[PDB]
Each structure stands twice: as structure tokens, then as C-alpha cells.
Design an enzyme around this catalytic site. Structure first.
Site, mmCIF file in Angstrom:
data_model
loop_
_atom_site.group_PDB
_atom_site.id
_atom_site.type_symbol
_atom_site.label_atom_id
_atom_site.label_comp_id
_atom_site.label_asym_id
_atom_site.label_seq_id
_atom_site.Cartn_x
_atom_site.Cartn_y
_atom_site.Cartn_z
ATOM 1 N N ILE D 82 0.854 -1.181 0.000
ATOM 2 C CA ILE D 82 0.000 0.000 0.000
ATOM 3 C C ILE D 82 0.889 1.229 0.000
ATOM 4 O O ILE D 82 1.701 1.420 0.912
ATOM 5 C CB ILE D 82 -0.946 0.012 1.207
ATOM 6 C CG1 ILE D 82 -1.887 -1.191 1.151
ATOM 7 C CG2 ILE D 82 -1.722 1.310 1.245
ATOM 8 C CD1 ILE D 82 -2.805 -1.188 -0.049
ATOM 9 N N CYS D 83 0.721 2.077 -1.011
ATOM 10 C CA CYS D 83 1.498 3.305 -1.110
ATOM 11 C C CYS D 83 0.737 4.408 -0.385
ATOM 12 O O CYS D 83 0.453 5.479 -0.923
ATOM 13 C CB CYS D 83 1.763 3.655 -2.566
ATOM 14 S SG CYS D 83 2.998 4.952 -2.793
ATOM 15 N N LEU D 84 0.399 4.133 0.871
ATOM 16 C CA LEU D 84 -0.268 5.101 1.729
ATOM 17 C C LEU D 84 0.803 5.933 2.411
ATOM 18 O O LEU D 84 1.581 5.410 3.213
ATOM 19 C CB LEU D 84 -1.156 4.416 2.766
ATOM 20 N N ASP D 114 3.960 7.732 -7.177
ATOM 21 C CA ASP D 114 4.408 6.588 -6.441
ATOM 22 C C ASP D 114 4.044 5.409 -7.295
ATOM 23 O O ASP D 114 3.116 4.665 -6.981
ATOM 24 C CB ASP D 114 3.709 6.581 -5.112
ATOM 25 C CG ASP D 114 4.192 7.690 -4.193
ATOM 26 O OD1 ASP D 114 5.234 8.306 -4.489
ATOM 27 O OD2 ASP D 114 3.529 7.950 -3.168
ATOM 28 N N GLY F 76 6.974 5.270 -3.277
ATOM 29 C CA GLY F 76 6.468 3.956 -2.936
ATOM 30 C C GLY F 76 5.755 3.304 -4.104
ATOM 31 O O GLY F 76 6.043 3.604 -5.263
#
Lengths: 157, 76, 156, 144, 76, 76, 76, 76, 76
Positions: D82-84, D114, F76
């Protein structure tokens, strides 16, 4: 599973005769076209129409097959015109025999029934339209139907 | 409209194109009909090369014009 | 490496012969492009070159460092070069039975396949020769003894 | 000494006020091993199964969360990463598991900077139609 | 300043880099020291990949940071 | 509309705004001094989030209300 | 005992059942109380899809709990 | 009342329908799975194209009536 | 400064200029009607050439002097 080439003159004749009995009966023909494995897969690999359908194993027989020619003409690599013409006049008669034998199949197949002849037309057309890559300078031979097969069906139909 | 192109062996595959389309835009319509990755896509028109990003109307290629699908020293 | 042991004497009297200030001036014969440093950057390196602002030629000091340079770039490279050879021997033997487990029943394709492994068995005998030859001269205790003596002396 | 007391209350907050498009709690019997695609998104028609493992320092560290249902999203790989930006930057001790589920439900809006899967990131950059088509394709494939 | 990077076999080639320099800018200083064309230049930092055009200061890569020169399924 | 803003360490600037402006336009008076890129435009307001793309009427920025600017380290 | 069942529209219905009842019984009650076909019904509890052959006591379903009901199927 | 339709490459599919369903509605029930532009609607029954404005009722469509999904109409 | 311009076939437009302007700014009143890109900004003056990059004081464009605009077909 159990290299179905034209070398083993004691196999493919029997395989052809196996269909020869079915094709005779008119009630057999009118429904032979709707069975399992008749059509190939919807997204079937173009080189997988050889071994993943009903007819593909029987009409693919043609002298152009690599191993048959390796055994006949590749054995005597420096043969003269008459020596290779011997192989020609030897094998062309067998070729004519098999062509006529399987044309007898497809005739009753077309004369099976209305849905039978529609199904056969569709079955040919589907194999056709997935071979447009054949007309390139360097087509993906390993990704395309063997030219023996697509050439045999030509003079057959 | 439609335009032409020919390889070394003489085959003449036509293909519809549009004035807005870039050279890579038309070359994207090449591997579909001949299976050639655009990494070797080499175009010559009137003896002069064509810029990759430039559009179709950048070489005054009229209707029923001629291209020449030649290849570099790549492949094999 | 032989030039080292005189000034690398087991009496350890020629230590002052090799100048520790050898890297105050810029290089004269050895390259520094890509030469990573210990605990300083190029920004301090170039300035410190100038920061002294002065140069007495001597073969001995140049030879000492060229010794280590050839040690690393040389047989130091060789040992890693052969480090993958042992893996390569297993890789070569991996396909040895892979091309033999197939049905070898052709007329002339079978002969071509047999010629394809007639060279492969010689290739195996050569890879094994290299692997069993590099190992022995590494096990040549005299040569490695000299090399380790040089290592100890240079460390001293 | 301190660890467990937060989880029970953050869990009973579900019974005190149930959520809109989610459901939480322990997956099985373990306390630290806890277990609905938006309509205005190609995920619609998809309800997801989640793997959660609170760390021993969960009240003071972000819990790593993994996916069980495959999805087609730029900020999501096959490993359910998860790119939280909250968990690795400002995962404050006051952020509830419910708040974390809300931030997950915010994933919907894709973050292009991301690109966890840049192949899907460029498609979101220019090829939104096939992006939304394939997202529904995999929605019906996995997230029944 | 100077930064680090390591291959699969453990070798640690350092190389100076600058905050302005892009990822391709630093990767251009790679084939010089290892002979690897940037076609396979794959960088992982903290488990996340790096965008091609992105600059050095786009991943808060401080001084004495760490890279990880990994490779894709390409080569051989 | 004088709205204060303070970074992590406690440094602050004095900037002007208008009630119907956008946060990126408010951010446009955040890169006047430091030159902070819009990619790092992070706003913190009492345990919630304030997306950059919205307006001041949506951020309810009152008179002399201090906002939080924190360097973004996305990835990310 | 009474429980909460939520459909995809967010419509909350209180269903008064007993733990001994099977999920098939619950889906029959749902089809009686709304007419919605049971084959389309997909009950979710704590991220778990339930089985009609199993009962409420099997999955620790207490009263006043929330169940999410998911529909499917379309015009083809 | 679901119907079958086959494409040029022959992808058999199902779609539940009604006697009053308009042809464009049926086509709109296709790009869901195939992603086809509805403007190029071209449906073939009994060797005839389907008048888009009308509904299925004016055609003698029966249970599991076969259709042909030939809508290339290209193009490019 | 009213300067006339005419293409190959004889069509002309009426455009305004200033004595100290640039030919590209004069060209900026040539793409106002047709939308002619600057890449084709060709000026012909009595057997000589007029580069686009210069100014009107260098092109000695007098009062009501007709210039020549010809479509450029550059490439080579």
C-alpha cells in the site's frame, strides 16, 4: 503422443480408414460436425491448430514434412536430377492417393447437413484468418501453421 | 487516406494513414501487418530519412504517395 | 611482487625507505579515475593536493603501490573470474543429460546432435581442466606463501 | 504491559459505530492477526479480503497490511503493498485502525508519483479507458 | 557528494553524484565503472524503484546513503 | 488574508492570501521565499489532510490561522 | 436475536434470527423480506464470505453485529 | 431471455435481454466485456443488419438466437 | 504598417504591422487567418532571401509593399 509423419506407411493408412467407415453413413455425417474437440480453442495458438483439434492430425500429412524429406532426399545429399526424380515419382503417387482419400471425407462432410457445411466453412475460415503473418519477409515460422498443412488444404478445398 | 510502402523483396503492403499521425504513429501500424518491432523501423522517402517524432504532414506526403520500408544492419 | 620483500624485510629496517607521503602530489604513473578513497571525497582530495603546494623521484615507492594495484586488478580479479567457473561446471553438466534424455532416433539430425555433444564433452573436460588447474596452483603453498608474506609486510 | 489494551477498544469501536463500506476484527482467534470497491470507480462490483498483522509495537508503529485479492492498480502490486503516505511518514499513534481503513478506502484516487507498478502508472497517465476496463475485468476475475 | 551501491555479488562501487543529477544522470556513471549499458540499469532504494527522469533529490537520498544495483530478467 | 505557516523546526514566514483563492495559489506564496516545489505542498490541519488541489473556501482558512508545512518525502 | 445486514446501497435492515439458524435460512429470510434472489446474495462479516451450509454459531456471529450483503449479476 | 453472439475470431458470449430492448441498448451491453465503440454498431441476424432505432421485437428473435459480432467497420 | 502578402495562386490577406517589429511577429499575423506554422514562414523579396529570425527594420518593409508567402517543403 503415442511424430505422425508419412514415413510409417503402416499407420496413416489405418488412421484414414478409421474415418473412412464413419464418413460413409449419412446419419453419421449430419452430426459428426458437432463434437468435442472439433473446433480448436477460440484464442488457440496458430501453431497449435496442428495438435489441438479433430482434423488437424489427419490432413496435416503431406510430403513437405521435414523428416520425410530428410530421410528420402537428405540421405543422398548429392543426388542428381534423376535420383531425386525417383523420390518424386515414388512419393507423388502416394500423395495423390491420400489427397483423393481425404477429399472423399470432406465431400460427405460438406454434404452432411446444413449446420455441417456451415461448421466446416467456419472451421476453415478460422484457421485462415489467423495466418496473415505468413506473408512477411521473415514470418514467425515457429509461430505459424506448417506450410505443408495450409498448402494441402488449399488444393483439397 | 491510404499510402504505400515496399520492402526489399518487392511486396507492397498498403495502409491507411492520417495527416496528424507521426512517423512512430504510422510505424505502430507496421508490426501488425508484417510483425516487425519498431526498434528496426527504418523509413526512407525520396532518398532522405524521416525524423522519429515528426508528423505525417512534415514531409508533404500527399495522397497515393510512396514510402520505402528499408532496414538497417539489425536482425540476425 | 619480488621487489617488495627487500624493503619488506623480516628485520623491518627499510620502512622509512617507502615514503608514506607518496600520495601528497597527484599521481604520476598510476590512475586515479574511479579510484575510490578511504575516508575522503574528491572535493577534499583536489584541494588537499593544492593545500600543501609543495617531488623527489624514487622507484621504490612507485613499485610498492603498483604491487598492490596489480594484486587487486590482477589475480584478485582472477580469483573471482574463476569463482563463477565452478558454477559454470554445474551449468554445463546440467544440459549434458538434457540433450541425451531426448529420443535420439534421427538419420542425419542424430549425427549432428552427436557432433553437438562430441564438442560438449571436450568442453566439459576443458572446464574441469581449468577448475582443477586453477585450484592446484592456488594450493601451490610456496607461491601463496610469498604472496601472504607480501601482504603481512605491506600491512606492517 | 501496554500492547493489547489499544486493540480491544479500537475493535469495540466497530460495535459502538459500524462503518459504511467495511468490516474489521480478528481474522481467526489471534489478537494481532486481523482480517468494497467504490461505485464511482472500476473496482465497483468488488469486495476484498485483507491480511493484517499488527506488530508488537502496533500502537507505536504502522501495521503492515497485505492483499489477498488481486487488483489492477498502479499503487498496488501482487504483494498488496500500500502506497499510503500516512503509514511511513505520519503514522501518528492517534490514528485509528478505522482511520487507516478510511485512507485505504481513499484507494479511488491514484497517486502517479508513487508508481509501484509503472506499467499501470503510465496507463493511468494516458490510457484510462483500458485501465478502467481491465480493472473491472480483474474485479470480476478475483473480487467477487 | 559520494554515495554507495552494491551488486548481487557484494562488490561496493562508490561514485560521486550531485543533487541536481537525474537517475539517468547517475546511471550514465555506471557503464564507465562496470561496463553495463543503461538498458538494464535497474535501481532499487528501500524496496521502491526509481523513476527514470527523476532527479537525485527526488528520493531524499542523503549523503552516505545506499543504493542497490539489482538487475531485471535481461542479459543472457 | 494574512495566514501564517510554520515548518517542523519552528521557522515561519508572513504571507498574504485572499478568501476565494486556492491552496496551490497559497502555496504559490510558499515558494516565493524558499522556492518549495508544488510536489511537496503538504498542509496539516488538526489531525486531518488538506489536498493541494482545492481552494481556500474549502480549507476554511480563518484570519491569522497558522497552517503546517512539512517537507514531503513521497515515494512507494 | 437481532443483527444488522447491509446491502450494497448501504440500506441497513435488522434481522431477528437465532444463532442455530443456517446461513441458508438467513438468505431465505432476506429473500422473503426484500424479494432479492438468494443466489446473488453474498454476505460479508469481518471480511469473510459465509456458507449456507453453516450456521451463525460457527462464525461467532453475535446479535447486533453488522453483516454486509453483496449483490451481483447484470443484464449480461 | 439471453442471446448468443459470435465475433470474427469467434468469441461466444451471453447477454440477458428483453423483447423491448433496443439494438443500441444491446450494443451497450457488449463493450462491458469487449470494449467496442457503440457508434460502429453492426449486428447481423439472418444475414441482415439490425435497424438500431427499432427494438428486438420487430425481429423474430427466439430463445438463444445466434448473432454475429462483426463491427470492425475500420478505420485504421 | 499595412503590408500585403500573397501566396502562389494569388490569394491575399490584409494585415497590420509596425516598423520596429520582427518578421516572426509579422508572421504572427500570417497564422492569424490560416494558422500557418512558423516552420513554413518563407519570405521572398526580389530574387533574395529573408530569414524569419530578423526584424522589420532589417527587411526594409516599406508602406504597402507586397511580400511573397510560399509554403515551405523543407527536408533533406
Amino acid at each position: 503422443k503415442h511424430h505422425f509423419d508419412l514415413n510409417e506407411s503402416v499407420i496413416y493408412n489405418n488412421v484414414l480408414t478409421i474415418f473412412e467407415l464413419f464418413v460413409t453413413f449419412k446419419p453419421i455425417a449430419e452430426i459428426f460436425t458437432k463434437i468435442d474437440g472439433f473446433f480448436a480453442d477460440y484464442s488457440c495458438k496458430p501453431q497449435d491448430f496442428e495438435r489441438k483439434t479433430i482434423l488437424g492430425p489427419i490432413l496435416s500429412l503431406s510430403p513437405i514434412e521435414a523428416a520425410v524429406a530428410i530421410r528420402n532426399y537428405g540421405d543422398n545429399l548429392l543426388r542428381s536430377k534423376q535420383q531425386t526424380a525417383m523420390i518424386h515419382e515414388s512419393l507423388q503417387a502416394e500423395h495423390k492417393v491420400v489427397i483423393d482419400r481425404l477429399f472423399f471425407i470432406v465431400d460427405k462432410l460438406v454434404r452432411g447437413s446444413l449446420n455441417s457445411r456451415t461448421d466446416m466453412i467456419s472451421y476453415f475460415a478460422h484457421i485462415a484468418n489467423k495466418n496473415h503473418l505468413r506473408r512477411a519477409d521473415h514470418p514467425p515460422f515457429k509461430e505459424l501453421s506448417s506450410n505443408g498443412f495450409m498448402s494441402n488444404i488449399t488444393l483439397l478445398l | 487516406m491510404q499510402i504505400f510502402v515496399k520492402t526489399l523483396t518487392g511486396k507492397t503492403i498498403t495502409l491507411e494513414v492520417e495527416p496528424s499521425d507521426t512517423i512512430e504513429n504510422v510505424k505502430a501500424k507496421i508490426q501488425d501487418k508484417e510483425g516487425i518491432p519498431p526498434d528496426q523501423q527504418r523509413l526512407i522517402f525520396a532518398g532522405c530519412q524521416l525524423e522519429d517524432g515528426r508528423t505525417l504532414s512534415d514531409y508533404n506526403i500527399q495522397k497515393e504517395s510512396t514510402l520505402h520500408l528499408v532496414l538497417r544492419l539489425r536482425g540476425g | 611482487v619480488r621487489f617488495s620483500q627487500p624493503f619488506l624485510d623480516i628485520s623491518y629496517k627499510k620502512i622509512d625507505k617507502i615514503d608514506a607521503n607518496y600520495f601528497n602530489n597527484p599521481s604520476l604513473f598510476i590512475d586515479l579515475s574511479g579510484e575510490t578513497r578511504l575516508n575522503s571525497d574528491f572535493k577534499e582530495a583536489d584541494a588537499f593536493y593544492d593545500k600543501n603546494r609543495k617531488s623527489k623521484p624514487n622507484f621504490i615507492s612507485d613499485c610498492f603501490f603498483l604491487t598492490l594495484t596489480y594484486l587487486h586488478y590482477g589475480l584478485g580479479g582472477t580469483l573471482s573470474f574463476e569463482e563463477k567457473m565452478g558454477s559454470e561446471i554445474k551449468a554445463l553438466k546440467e544440459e549434458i543429460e538434457k540433450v541425451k534424455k531426448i529420443a535420439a532416433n534421427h538419420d542425419v539430425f542424430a549425427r549432428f546432435i552427436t557432433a553437438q555433444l562430441s564438442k560438449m564433452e571436450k568442453a566439459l573436460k576443458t572446464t574441469e581442466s581449468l577448475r582443477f588447474a586453477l585450484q592446484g596452483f592456488f594450493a601451490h603453498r610456496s607461491l601463496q606463501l610469498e604472496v601472504f608474506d607480501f601482504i603481512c609486510g605491506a600491512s606492517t | 504491559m501496554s500492547s493489547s489494551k489499544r486493540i480491544a477498544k479500537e475493535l469495540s469501536d466497530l460495535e459502538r459505530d459500524p462503518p459504511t463500506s467495511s468490516s474489521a476484527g480478528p481474522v481467526g482467534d489471534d489478537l494481532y492477526h486481523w482480517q468494497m470497491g467504490p461505485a464511482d470507480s472500476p473496482y465497483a462490483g468488488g469486495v476484498f479480503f485483507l491480511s493484517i498483522h499488527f506488530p508488537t509495537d502496533y500502537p507505536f508503529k504502522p501495521p503492515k497490511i497485505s492483499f489477498t485479492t488481486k487488483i489492477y492498480h498502479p499503487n498496488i502490486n501482487a504483494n498488496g503493498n500500500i502506497c499510503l503516505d500516512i503509514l511511513k511518514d505520519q503514522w501518528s499513534p492517534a490514528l485509528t485502525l478505522s482511520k487507516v481503513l478510511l485512507s485505504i478506502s481513499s484507494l479511488t484516487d491514484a497517486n502517479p508519483d508513487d508508481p509501484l507498478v509503472p506499467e499501470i502508472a503510465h496507463i493511468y497517465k494516458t490510457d484510462r479507458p483500458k485501465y478502467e476496463a481491465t480493472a473491472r475485468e480483474w474485479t470480476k476475475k478475483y473480487a467477487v
